[PDB]
Ligand binder design. Structure first.
Ligand SMILES: [K+]
Ligand SMILES: [K+]
Ligand SMILES: [Mg+2]
Ligand SMILES: [Mg+2]
Ligand SMILES: [Mg+2]
Ligand SMILES: [Mg+2]
Lengths: 351, 50, 51
C-alpha cells in the first residue's frame, strides 16, 4: 500500500493546534469573561473594536428650521444654525456595547453668531433610549461660545442641568435631539459644526476625560476642509486570550490569523512563562521561539484604529482592525513513548 | 533515586481523592508502563519494566 | 414615569431587581423651594411592573 485509498484529511505530528477561533462561540470561549461594558464586538466575521464615537457632520444631521451657515473654518465648510424656538437637530445611533452612564459625553463643535459677542438661544437636549426620554438644559439663555469642542453632557454653560448619568444598553436605538427652546439675540444662532455622542473610554484609558482617548483638533485650515476630530473607534485594545494549555513543553509556536488591516500598533505577543511576551509586529503569520521549553502558552493581541482620509470627518481612525480565523500551533511531541519498544502517535483532526 | 519516569508529563487531573495505588497505576499508564511498589528496604520505587 | 424618564433631573433608577416578598418602601420627597405655591400636585401614584 503506497497511499491511503481516497484520503479525506491530513494533519501533522510535528505541530499541534493548541488554540483556535473561527465562530462567535469559539471567540467568546477564548476571550474569557469580558464585561458587557467592554468595546469589543464578537461576530460571524471576527472580533472587532466597537464603534465608540458617532461623529456626525452638520449636513448629515436631521434638519428642521435650522439655518445653513457657511464659514471656511467649519467642518465641510458648513454648520447648522439653531436660529429660533422649536427648531431642532436629530441623530440616531445604536451602541454595540453597554455605555456606562458616567462615561457618556456629547461633544459639539459649536460657535455663537459667527464668533460675535451676542447670545444664542438656550438649548435643550433630549436623549431617547427605546422610548425612555432624558431631557436636560446645558446652555443658558445668555451665553456665547467661541469655536471649540464642548461637552454638553457633563458640563453646563449657563445651563441648569447635565446628563442624568444613565447606562445605555447594547442594541438600544438611541435618538438624540438638540432643540433651541427659546428666542435668539443673534440671528445666525448657535452654529453646530459636527456632533459627537461618544463613550469617553475612561475605564480603558486611565485619564479622567475623553481628551485622553480621542483627538479633538480645532483647525481644519480654514479652507472649507475636514477635521481629524473624535475618531469613531477606540485607539488600542489589548486583548488577553485564555491560556492555551499543554501536557508537554512548548519550545516554539506559530500563529495564523485573518485580518482586514495589520498597520500601526498591530501585534501578537506570545509567552511560555506567563510574563516574558515575545512580539510579532504587523503580520498575520508569525513564529516565536521561547527562551526555554515550558508548558502553557499565553497570548496578547493589539487591535487598533486605522485609515487616513481627506473627504470626510473624522479624517483618522474611521476603521477598526477585525480578526477572525485565529490559530495557534505549537511544537509538541505527538509521537510518544508508551512501553518498552512501543510508541503512541496522537494526531488531532480539528472539529 | 528509585524514581525513573520514562515519559514525564504534566498532570491535568486533580487526583485529590483516588486511592494512591489507583493514582500510581494511572501515572504508569500515562508514562511507559512502569513498575511501582514498596521494596524490602521499605522504600518506594517507580521505574521501567523488565 | 419617574423611574425611567427624567425632566431636568440628576439621576434615574439604577435598574435593580425587586425580589419576591421584599418590603418595598417608596418615598417621594421635595428637595428644593418651589416657584409655584401649589408645587407638584400628586393625584395618583402607581409603582408598577411594566410587563
Ligand atoms: K459586548
Ligand atoms: K502505557
Ligand atoms: Mg429656524
Ligand atoms: Mg455624567
Ligand atoms: Mg460642519
Ligand atoms: Mg429602568
Amino acid at each position: 500500500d503506497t497511499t491511503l485509498g481516497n484520503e479525506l484529511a491530513n494533519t501533522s505530528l510535528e505541530e499541534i493546534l493548541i488554540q483556535s477561533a473561527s465562530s462567535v462561540s469559539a471567540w467568546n470561549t477564548i476571550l474569557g469573561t469580558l464585561a458587557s461594558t467592554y468595546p469589543l464586538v464578537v461576530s460571524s466575521s471576527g472580533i472587532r473594536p466597537a464603534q465608540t464615537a458617532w461623529t456626525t457632520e452638520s449636513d448629515n444631521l436631521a434638519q428642521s428650521g435650522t439655518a445653513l451657515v457657511t464659514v471656511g473654518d467649519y467642518s465641510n465648510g458648513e454648520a447648522e444654525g439653531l436660529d429660533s424656538p422649536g427648531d431642532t437637530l436629530e441623530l440616531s445611533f445604536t451602541p454595540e456595547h453597554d455605555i456606562p452612564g458616567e462615561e457618556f459625553a456629547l461633544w459639539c463643535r459649536i460657535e455663537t453668531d459667527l464668533g460675535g459677542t451676542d447670545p444664542g438661544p438656550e438649548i435643550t437636549v433630549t436623549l431617547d433610549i427605546d422610548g425612555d426620554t432624558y431631557s436636560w438644559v446645558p446652555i443658558g439663555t445668555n451665553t456665547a461660545l467661541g469655536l471649540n469642542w464642548y461637552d454638553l453632557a457633563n458640563n453646563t454653560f449657563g445651563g441648569s442641568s447635565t446628563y442624568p448619568d444613565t447606562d445605555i444598553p447594547e442594541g438600544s436605538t438611541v435618538t438624540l435631539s438638540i432643540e433651541a427652546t427659546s428666542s435668539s439675540v443673534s440671528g445666525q444662532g448657535h452654529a453646530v459644526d459636527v456632533m459627537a455622542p461618544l463613550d469617553a473610554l475612561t475605564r480603558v484609558t486611565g485619564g479622567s476625560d475623553a481628551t485622553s482617548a480621542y483627538t479633538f483638533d480645532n483647525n481644519n485650515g480654514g479652507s472649507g476642509g475636514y477635521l481629524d476630530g473624535p475618531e469613531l473607534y477606540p485607539d488600542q485594545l489589548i486583548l488577553s486570550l485564555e491560556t492555551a494549555t499543554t501536557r508537554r513543553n512548548v519550545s516554539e509556536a506559530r500563529f495564523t490569523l485573518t485580518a482586514n488591516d495589520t498597520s500601526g500598533n498591530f501585534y501578537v505577543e506570545l509567552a511560555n512563562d506567563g510574563s516574558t511576551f515575545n512580539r510579532v509586529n504587523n503580520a498575520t503569520s508569525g513564529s516565536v521561539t521561547f527562551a526555554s521549553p515550558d508548558t502553557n502558552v499565553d497570548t496578547n493581541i493589539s487591535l487598533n484604529r486605522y485609515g487616513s482620509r481627506s473627504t470626510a470627518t473624522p479624517q483618522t481612525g474611521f476603521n477598526a482592525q477585525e480578526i477572525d480565523n485565529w490559530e495557534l500551533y505549537a511544537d509538541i511531541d505527538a509521537v510518544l513513548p508508551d512501553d518498552i519498544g512501543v510508541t503512541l502517535s496522537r494526531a488531532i483532526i480539528p472539529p | 533515586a528509585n524514581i525513573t519516569v520514562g515519559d514525564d508529563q504534566e498532570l491535568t487531573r486533580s487526583y485529590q481523592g483516588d486511592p494512591v495505588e489507583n493514582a500510581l497505576r494511572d501515572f504508569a499508564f500515562k508514562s511507559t508502563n512502569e513498575d511501582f511498589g514498596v521494596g524490602d528496604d521499605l522504600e518506594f520505587f517507580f521505574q521501567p519494566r523488565e
